[PDB]
């Protein structure tokens, strides 16, 4: 098996177009009304090719 590091990771360089987000990432609201989510999790997910990149969880939907 040959190396695949370059195909597996993409770093970001200062003020570089190629080393940058060349796509509009999908900012999905995983939950709260999602079967996978337990019901009170609002996870802002940054998908890029259906691969998670950035997580922003909001968990205050069940604060009491």
């Amino acid at each position: 098996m040959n190396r695949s590091i370059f195909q597996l990771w993409k770093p970001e360089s200062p003020r570089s177009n190629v080393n940058s987000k060349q796509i509009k990432t999908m900012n999905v609201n995983f939950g709260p009304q999602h079967p996978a989510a337990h019901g009170v999790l609002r996870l802002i997910l940054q998908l890029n090719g259906e691969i998670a990149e950035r997580f922003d969880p909001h968990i205050g939907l069940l604060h009491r």
Partner: protein
């Protein structure tokens, strides 16, 4: 008159919509565990033809099962509005009914009925699986009878007008 055809068709429609009564896969708190217990074999919900659907567009019942927080009330309102008509709402648990244990809290809404029109309430904390089954069956009977509750008056020929 149209009633000759409407009334039997009304009965058929009521029977069909009672038999196929798909709730929404939406649980917020411990009452979701009781909802799953009512779904599972011991009290097979499928026996009464109720199958949970994930998307609100494919749901007939809104099972508000769990506490409602101020941070979530807009979400519940949006889900209720986006659920396709006709639809009914069943509050489950003390928290969903009237705020339950957290009625004196600064974050919990004092009842889901303040945000949604609640068709039926199921008291409990948590309501038993049989309690939820009873509430669902009573809601189904009421739904079947809602089509014609004797609103229109009968004339001398016994035809509603």
């Amino acid at each position: 008159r149209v009633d000759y055809i409407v009334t039997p068709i009304n009965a058929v429609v009521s029977w069909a919509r009672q038999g196929s009564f798909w709730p929404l896969t939406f649980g917020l708190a411990c009452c979701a565990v009781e909802m799953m217990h009512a779904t599972v074999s011991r009290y097979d919900f499928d026996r009464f033809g109720v199958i949970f659907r994930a998307t609100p567009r494919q749901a007939d019942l809104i099972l508000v099962a769990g506490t409602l927080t101020n941070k979530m009330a807009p979400g519940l309102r949006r889900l209720y509005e986006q659920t396709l008509d006709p639809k009914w709402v069943l509050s489950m648990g003390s928290c969903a009914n009237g705020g339950g244990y957290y009625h004196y809290s600064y974050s919990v809404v004092r009842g889901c009925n303040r945000i949604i029109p609640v068709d039926i309430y199921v008291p409990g904390c948590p309501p038993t699986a049989e309690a939820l089954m009873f509430g669902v069956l009573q809601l189904q009977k009421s739904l079947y009878r809602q089509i014609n509750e004797g609103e229109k008056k009968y004339n001398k020929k016994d035809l509603t007008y």
